């Protein structure tokens, strides 16, 4: 079986990630009583370029048969939540759109889309906005995350 771990992710500004819809995630600060709403990811180690600073991963939602993916939509790299066949996932060789390059930078994590280099899993500085794929060089949007094991 493919090597995986159960974890939560919080952005640089400590916002939690929640399942706002059947195929959507949102980021917002969660008070001590609403913490349980945060999504638990099952992060798998897929095939690709091995490095202590950059490793290929797939981000699934624990026991939900949902994976994050990046696809081109109207010429724009777009983050999606896709339902998968429970009998075929997780697998070592994932379809290219599911692969993220996990980067360890300044005691934080960045998730670069493997097929869209320079595009990262991002959050808005504002509250309760969807999690998206961002390509901005360094400004308004957050691309840095902390990981907490489950």
């Amino acid at each position, epitope marked *: 079986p493919v090597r995986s771990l159960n974890c939560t992710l919080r952005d640089s500004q400590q916002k939690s990630l929640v399942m706002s819809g059947p195929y959507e995630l949102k980021a917002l600060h969660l008070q001590g009583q609403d913490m349980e709403q945060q999504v638990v990811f099952s992060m798998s180690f897929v095939q690709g370029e091995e490095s202590n600073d950059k490793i290929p991963v797939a981000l699934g939602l624990k026991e939900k048969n949902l994976y994050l993916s990046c696809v081109l939509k109207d010429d724009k790299p777009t983050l999606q939540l896709e339902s998968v066949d429970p009998k075929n996932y997780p697998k070592k060789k994932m379809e290219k759109r599911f692969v993220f390059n996990k980067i360890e930078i300044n005691n934080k994590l960045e998730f670069e889309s493997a*097929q869209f280099p320079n595009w990262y899993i991002s959050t808005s500085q504002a509250e309760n906005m969807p999690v998206f794929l961002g390509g901005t060089k360094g400004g308004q949007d957050i691309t840095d995350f902390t990981m907490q094991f489950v």
Partner: antibody, heavy 120, light 108 residues
Framework: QVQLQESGPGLVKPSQTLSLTCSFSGFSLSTSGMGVGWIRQPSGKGLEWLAHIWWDGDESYNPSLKSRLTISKDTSKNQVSLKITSVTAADTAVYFC????????????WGQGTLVTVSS | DIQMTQSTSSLSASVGDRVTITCRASQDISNYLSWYQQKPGKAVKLLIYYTSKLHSGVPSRFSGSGSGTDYTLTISSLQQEDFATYFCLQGKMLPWTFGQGTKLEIKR
């Protein structure tokens, strides 16, 4: 603009290895997201996906013949090769190469194809 | 493997007819479907991608629809040059699989 062209030996004996080449121009296979696939069509039958290779060398194969296939790229010659070992009369077909950018693949440009007959 | 099926193997239709070609996936393919046209003595051409997006250079009489498992390629007003075999392809899961193809003949 973009062109793909298949070449190969035309006639091969059963149990031999078949080597096919996809010569391409008008794009670089080292460009992020770029891919080249091989598809075949036996006489009177439909299209069958065989193999694929991404810009980063990640190979994909159809399990119905994965053990017999090898796909490779040469970005210095702008060529994608397909090697099929232990061929049989079931491998007689027109072989095509096609390109895409990103997953899921939309095969935007296809070659004219190369006919391979497997016979003694 | 996701099985792709095209219930019509061959049919004939008249110039001007609204032609419908169906493709059914064995499981949810999340609109990751594309349509290809194969003409005699010519390289296969992409017509429609991501269920409904028209490939650049393809006439507007070609359109695509569907979701989940059921998909349709429509030719609004059939032309004599539309004689070809049409194949659907799923990109949801490896191995990528094609429909068996639908050969469309022109009635005259």
């Amino acid at each position: 603009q973009v062109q793909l062209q298949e070449s190969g030996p035309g006639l091969v004996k059963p149990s031999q290895t078949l080597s096919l080449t996809c010569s391409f121009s008008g794009f670089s296979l080292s460009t992020s997201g770029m891919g080249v696939g091989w598809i075949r069509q036996p006489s009177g039958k439909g299209l069958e996906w065989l193999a694929h290779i991404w810009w980063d060398g990640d190979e994909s194969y159809n399990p119905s013949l994965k053990s017999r296939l090898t796909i490779s790229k040469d970005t210095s010659k702008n060529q994608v090769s397909l090697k099929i070992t232990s061929v049989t009369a079931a491998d007689t077909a027109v072989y095509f190469c096609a390109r895409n950018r990103y997953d899921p693949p939309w095969f935007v440009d296809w070659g004219q194809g190369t006919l391979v007959t497997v016979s003694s | 493997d996701i099985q792709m099926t095209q219930s019509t193997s061959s049919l004939s239709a008249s110039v001007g007819d609204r032609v419908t070609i169906t493709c059914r996936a064995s499981q949810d393919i999340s609109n990751y479907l594309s349509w290809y046209q194969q003409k005699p003595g010519k390289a296969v051409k992409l017509l429609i991608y991501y269920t409904s997006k028209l490939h650049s250079g393809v006439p507007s009489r070609f359109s695509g629809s569907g979701s989940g498992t059921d998909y349709t390629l429509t030719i609004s007003s059939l032309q004599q040059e539309d004689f070809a075999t049409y194949f659907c392809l799923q990109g949801k899961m490896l191995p990528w699989t094609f429909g068996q193809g639908t050969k469309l003949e022109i009635k005259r």
